[PDB]
Design an enzyme around this catalytic site. Sequence first.
Site, short mmCIF file in Angstrom:
data_model
loop_
_atom_site.label_atom_id
_atom_site.label_comp_id
_atom_site.label_asym_id
_atom_site.label_seq_id
_atom_site.Cartn_x
_atom_site.Cartn_y
_atom_site.Cartn_z
N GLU A 138 0.78 -1.23 0.10
CA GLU A 138 -0.15 0.02 0.06
C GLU A 138 0.89 1.05 -0.02
O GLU A 138 2.22 1.14 0.10
CB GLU A 138 -0.99 0.10 1.18
CG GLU A 138 -0.19 -0.13 2.68
CD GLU A 138 -1.22 0.24 3.62
OE1 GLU A 138 -1.74 0.96 3.86
OE2 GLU A 138 -1.41 -1.16 4.39
N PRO A 802 -6.78 24.83 -37.61
CA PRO A 802 -6.97 23.48 -37.16
C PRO A 802 -6.32 22.42 -37.68
O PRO A 802 -5.43 21.61 -37.12
CB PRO A 802 -8.46 23.09 -37.30
CG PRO A 802 -9.12 24.41 -38.01
CD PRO A 802 -8.27 25.46 -37.84
CA LIG Z 1 -5.52 19.30 -36.17
#
Ligand SMILES: [Ca+2]
Length: 876
Positions: A138, A802
């Site tokens: 743990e 983009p």
């Molecule tokens: Ca892109």
Amino acid sequence: MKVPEKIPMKPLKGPLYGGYFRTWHDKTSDPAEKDKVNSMGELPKEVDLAFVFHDWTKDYSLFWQELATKHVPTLNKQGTRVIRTIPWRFLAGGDHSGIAEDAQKYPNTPEGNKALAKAIVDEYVYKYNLDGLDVMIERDSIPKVNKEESKEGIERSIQVFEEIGKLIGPKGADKSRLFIMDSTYMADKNPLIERGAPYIDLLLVQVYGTQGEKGGFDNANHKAVDTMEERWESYSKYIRPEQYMVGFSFYEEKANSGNLWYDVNVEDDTNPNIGSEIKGTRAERYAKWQPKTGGVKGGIFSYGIDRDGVAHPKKNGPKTPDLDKIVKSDYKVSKALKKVMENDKSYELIDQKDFPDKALREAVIAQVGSRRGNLERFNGTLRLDNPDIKSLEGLNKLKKLAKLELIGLSQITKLDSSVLPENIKPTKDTLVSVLETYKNDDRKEEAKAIPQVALTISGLTGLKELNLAGFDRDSLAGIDAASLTSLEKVDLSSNKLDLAAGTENRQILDTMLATVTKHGGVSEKTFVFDHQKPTGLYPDTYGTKSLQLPVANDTIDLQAKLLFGTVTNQGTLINSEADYKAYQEQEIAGHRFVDSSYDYKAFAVTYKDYKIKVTDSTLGVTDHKDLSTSKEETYKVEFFSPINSTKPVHEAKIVVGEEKTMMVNLAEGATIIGGDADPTNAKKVFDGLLNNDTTTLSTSNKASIIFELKEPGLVKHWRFFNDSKISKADYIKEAKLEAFVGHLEDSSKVKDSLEKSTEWVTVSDYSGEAQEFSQPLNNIGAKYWRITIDNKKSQYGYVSLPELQIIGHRLPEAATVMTTMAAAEELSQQKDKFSQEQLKELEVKVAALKAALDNKMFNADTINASFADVKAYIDK
Ligand SMILES: [Ca+2]
Ligand SMILES: CC(=O)N[C@H]1[C@H](O[C@@H]2[C@@H](OC[C@H]3O[C@@H](O[C@H]4[C@H](O)[C@H]5[NH+]=C(C)O[C@H]5O[C@@H]4CO)[C@@H](O)[C@@H](O[C@H]4O[C@H](CO)[C@@H](O)[C@H](O)[C@@H]4O[C@@H]4O[C@H](CO)[C@@H](O[C@@H]5O[C@H](CO[C@]6(C(=O)O)C[C@H](O)[C@@H](NC(C)=O)[C@H]([C@H](O)[C@H](O)CO)O6)[C@H](O)[C@H](O)[C@H]5O)[C@H](O)[C@H]4NC(C)=O)[C@@H]3O)O[C@H](CO)[C@@H](O)[C@@H]2O)O[C@H](CO)[C@@H](O[C@@H]2O[C@H](CO[C@]3(C(=O)O)C[C@H](O)[C@@H](NC(C)=O)[C@H]([C@H](O)[C@H](O)CO)O3)[C@H](O)[C@H](O)[C@H]2O)[C@@H]1O
């Protein structure tokens, strides 16, 4: 100190109860703490595993002598094993790592790690003649160096763990010592389970508190995560269910928040004994809990068993400091919890009431488990191949079997639902969980479907009756029909069998039909196979992968032409309802087998939410089913199931007119050289995502990127997109694309300052307002490019990009083949440098390279040969 030698002990049999005894609460730990009144030797026989959980007890304390000389013999005499618990990091070295702190004596080497494992077992097991080792995995015990978690120590601990397992545990030299792992982690977060699981006898999971029981809560999805069932299933990959034990905690004195588990009864003034009652506590729920598949669990354990009987302080209520007083425990909770599990139906032994045939009874116990709880849960394979089995009575008690194999059982005459598993037919899980669920989940999912048992029948030479009617069986696979040589009565009706001609199913049925008819006395009652409702599946492959079409003013449906059909699990394809009725009217021995009420739409799959992706040769992409053929173009077409939108079920090339080569985006993954654009978002211009709104904005209002094609080729097209539908009138409105003319300025070590300072050539100047723009280009072979964009907004216009695509064909050193050819008419429009009849033997070779380069079928090897042999005609 004289340590007594190991005492004969009866073998461990579950259900097991374990207890972590905190050493500082043994009387002999610190004689000055007069409040410390308990004794590890006082633990009752109901405790199978007493765990020595050590802290605060001095190296020189008389507890260690008491443990070795008095406690261990006393506990072994009653059958209680004494287990030494050590933290994970003892196997790693570094901070607070016990024996392993001596890094010079036990170096991190293959031989040093072998020596550390031997030292660990000698020190923590053999020194006091303990019965095993429990390694605690743990965050509390993670390997650390200078208070920092050590990945290196974690890797080492894996090695040391395997070495210990070769010394003790089921795979060790000394199998008389247990090797145990406890952990808080889910199995996928346990770094040691994958290599450590074969070496351990038991796995203990610490699941204290309501969050161990119910799992955590996913705040967004409003579901429980890391439930008791999901925790077990994560470890079912590695261990058997009888190795699995789950833990709760008693109330530790003066516990802070974060150490309050409420696993036992909360105090009540009017009942001073309520802490020793167990009914309805989380502890009792853990005692009764069982996994839904696999088998019964190994048992349960408690933390701080020296606090057995103390009630828990109230959550919301005035303080009760009386609960923090140390009192001597009578271990009443532990005794009652052990008896709860020992008296549970799950641990009832499989006896003659279940399987009268001892040969069958011994096969089930050997393979499924000795406990009745395993009949309800067992999830694997039961192979029955002992020919002594004269009766399968009791097989109906198996509820979740994955596979039943009946092999060579000569003396079995009949097979029907009374001697077959309960999940021969569709069934729902009937086991009810005893655990609390999330009040904030409203979770009562209705009784998961149990997968049906796969049935293998081979060599049952005495089988006269085979009745599998009404079980919704998906196939006959596994039935070795030729071996069932005594069949007289067969009923396979009301299932999901495709019995069409050429199927495997039909051949098994036909083989059984031959046997039954040869016996004679065949009536309408004797061999029945009708009312079949075979499942309609999606075809794996589709028939049309290439289509050449003529240029014509017409639209076609690509989905209608390329993607349709329904198959059975035997491969029988049906195109349409017309085809299906033909299938529905098939006959075996003059009798139809398909259910008459099972119409086409009940059977046929649907392509409703299937998507299409059509990309032309210039990489223009649409998702339109309908395709015009008026324009001459070559398309790649891909279809996607709704279940997987990254990964097409079918692909096809559609050629309209003459074929064109499919171009590629050479700017894909281009490395950013220069420009003023944001380096993080500039990289996203070339990743491949046309809706890459991970914030693709490059600057405030006007951006430039200089980039290098990762491997240059022949450029014939380019494309760029504005933010797809997320914004409008913020579009790029002006764009300029430039190519660098092969003139690296003698500073190839820098290559950024050079490009920001040379004279380029402009391959295109875009001005417009389209969402997307594409344009042909004139066979540029440049490796270095610059794009400049402008959305004509204020100086805080935050222009975005983009994707940008530079599109062509892969051809290394396409720059050379256009340097040479450019000079091929800087030499053939001017006569009399070399001019003879040689000039027209040039012009036939320049006209054949412009034709080779500007060809719809781009062949690189053709251009090289045309480029190489124009190169030959310059020195001559
Ligand atoms: Ca892109
Ligand atoms: C073993 C080890 O390792 N250890 C470590 C640790 O660890 C940890 C631990 O834990 C424990 C815990 O637990 C918990 O629980 C839990 C668990 O864990 C888990 N498990 C399971 C299964 O389950 C789970 O969960 C659970 C629950 O949660 C708990 O139980 C706890 O308990 C607690 O709490 C509770 C409540 O809650 C309660 O009830 C209880 O009871 C408890 O409490 C506590 O109590 C106690 C008792 O009393 C207390 O105490 C204290 O004490 C102190 C002492 O002191 C002194 C000294 O020391 O010196 C004494 C003297 O005498 C004096 N003097 C005079 C008087 O004159 C002094 C003074 O002070 C002067 O003045 C000076 O100034 O002092 C004191 O007394 C005080 O006051 C007291 O108080 C306490 O407090 C309490 N608390 C509370 C809060 O309440 C438990 O505890 O264990 C485990 C296992 O084992 C693990 O895992 C863990 O992690 O840790 C720690 C931290 O880090 C550490 O510490 C440290 O240490 C060091 C040392 O050490 C060593 C080294 O060196 O390194 C180690 C090694 O290993 C070894 N070995 C080898 C090397 O080999 C070593 C040896 O020993 C040698 O020496 C060397 O060589 O060592 C140091 O010390 C430092 O400092 C520290 O820090 C440890 O270690």
